[PDB]
Amino acid sequence: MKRAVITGLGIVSSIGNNQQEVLASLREGRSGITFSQELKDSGMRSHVWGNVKLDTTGLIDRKVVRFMSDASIYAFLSMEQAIADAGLSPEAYQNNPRVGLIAGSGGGSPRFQVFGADAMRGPRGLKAVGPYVVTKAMASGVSACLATPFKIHGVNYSISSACATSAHCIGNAVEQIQLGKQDIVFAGGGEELCWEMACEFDAMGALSTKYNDTPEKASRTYDAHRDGFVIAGGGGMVVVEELEHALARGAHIYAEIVGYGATSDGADMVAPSGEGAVRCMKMAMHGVDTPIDYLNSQGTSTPVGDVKELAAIREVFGDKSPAISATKAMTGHSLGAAGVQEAIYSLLMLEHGFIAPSINIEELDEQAAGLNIVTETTDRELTTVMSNSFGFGGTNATLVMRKLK
Ligand X SMILES: *C(=O)CCCCCCCCCCC
Instruction: Give the residues lining the site for ligand X (CB under 6 A).
Output: 106-107, 110, 113, 133-134, 137-138, 162-163, 197, 200, 335-336, 391-392
Listed in sequence order, the residues at least 6 apart from 144 whose beta carbon sits closer than 8 Å to its beta carbon are 72, 135, 138, 156, 158
**CB-based contacts of 310, cutoff 8 Å, min separation 6:** 222, 297, 367, 368, 371
Residue 253 binding its own copies, by CB under 8 A: no
Using CA atoms, how far apart are residues 359 and 223, in angstroms rounded to an integer?
9
Q: How far is the CB of 397 from ligand X (least distance, A)?
A: 11
Q: Count CB atoms within 10 A of the CB of residue 261.
A: 24
| 36: contact with ligand NH4 by CB under 6 A | no
Q: Which stretch binds ligand NH4 (CB under 6 A): 29-37, 61-69, 184-192, 383-391?
A: 383-391
Q: How far apart are CA 282 and CA 386, in angstroms?
A: 11
C-beta separation of 100 from 185 below 8 A: yes
- Write down the least CB distance from residue 390 to ligand NH4, Å: 9
Residues 317-346 binding ligand NH4 (CB under 6 A) are: 342
Q: What are phi and psi of 41, to 5 degrees?
A: -60, -25
Please tell me the distance from the alpha carbon of residue 330 to that of residue 301, in angstroms, as a whole number: 11
Burial of 10 (C-beta count, 10 Å sphere; 0-12/13-18/19+):
buried
By beta-carbon proximity to ligand X, the closer residue of 98 and 136 is 136
Among 78-86, 273-281, 303-311, 384-392, the segment contacting ligand NH4 (CB under 6 A): 384-392
129's contact among its own copies, ligand X, ligand NH4, none, with CB below 5 to 8 A by partner kind, is its own copies
- Phi, psi dihedrals of residue 296, rounded to the nearest 5°: -90, 105
Out of 36, 161, 296, 384, the only residue in the binding site for ligand NH4 (CB under 6 A) is 296
CA 106 to chain centre: 10
* Beta carbons within 8 Å of 189's beta carbon, 6+ residues apart: 71, 75, 103, 104, 105, 142, 158, 165, 166, 169, 235, 236, 237, 336, 337, 339, 340
In angstroms, give the least distance from the CB of 137 to ligand X.
4
For the CB of residue 247, give the shortest distance to ligand NH4 in the complex, in Å.
Answer: 28
Cross-strand bridge partners of residue 100: 185
Shortest CB 89 distance to its own copies, Å: 16
Distance between CA atoms of 380 and 115, rounded to whole angstroms?
49
Residue 242 main-chain phi, psi, to 5 deg:
-65, 135
> How remote is the C-alpha of 345 from its chain's centroid?
10
276 sits near its own copies (criterion: CB under 8 A): yes
> By C-beta, is 109 or 297 nearer to ligand NH4?
297
- At 180, the amino acid letter reads G
Breaks (C-N over 2.5 A) in the chain follow: none
162 binds its own copies (CB under 8 A): yes
5 or 335: whose CB is closer to ligand X?
A: 335
Q: How far apart are CA 156 and CA 100, in angstroms?
A: 6
387 near ligand NH4, judged by CB under 6 A:
yes
- Rounded to a whole number of angstroms, the distance between the first and last alpha carbons of the chain is 19
Among residues 138 and 262, whose Cβ is nearest to ligand X?
Answer: 138
Closest CB to its own copies among 59 and 204? 204
Position 308 contacts its own copies (CB under 8 A): no
Residue 179 CB, shortest distance to ligand NH4, in Å, is 24
C-beta closer to ligand NH4: residue 191 or 242: 191
Beta strands 354-355 and 378-379 are: antiparallel
Size, binding site for ligand NH4 by CB under 6 A: 7
For the chain, state the CA radius of gyration: 20
Q: Considering only 52-60, 223-231, 276-284, 381-389, which stretch makes contact with ligand NH4 by CB under 6 A?
A: 381-389
79 binds its own copies (CB under 8 A): no
Q: Does 106 bind its own copies (CB under 8 A)?
A: yes
Which amino acid appears at position 172 of this protein?
N
Q: Kindly state the smallest distance separating residue 284's Cβ from ligand X, in Å.
A: 19
Find the shortest distance in angstroms from Cβ 314 to ligand NH4: 17
Interaction partner, residue 35 (ligand X, its own copies, ligand NH4, none; CB < 5-8 Å by kind): none
Instruction: Tell me the angle at which helices 275-284 and 303-317 cross, rounded to the nearest 10 degrees.
Output: 50
Instruction: Determine the residue with CB nearest ligand NH4.
Output: 342
Binding mask 35-54 for its own copies (x = CB under 8 A): -------xxxx---------
Please, which residue, 96 or 157, has the CB nearer to ligand X? 157
Give residues in contact with ligand NH4 (CB under 6 A).
Answer: 296-298, 342, 387-389
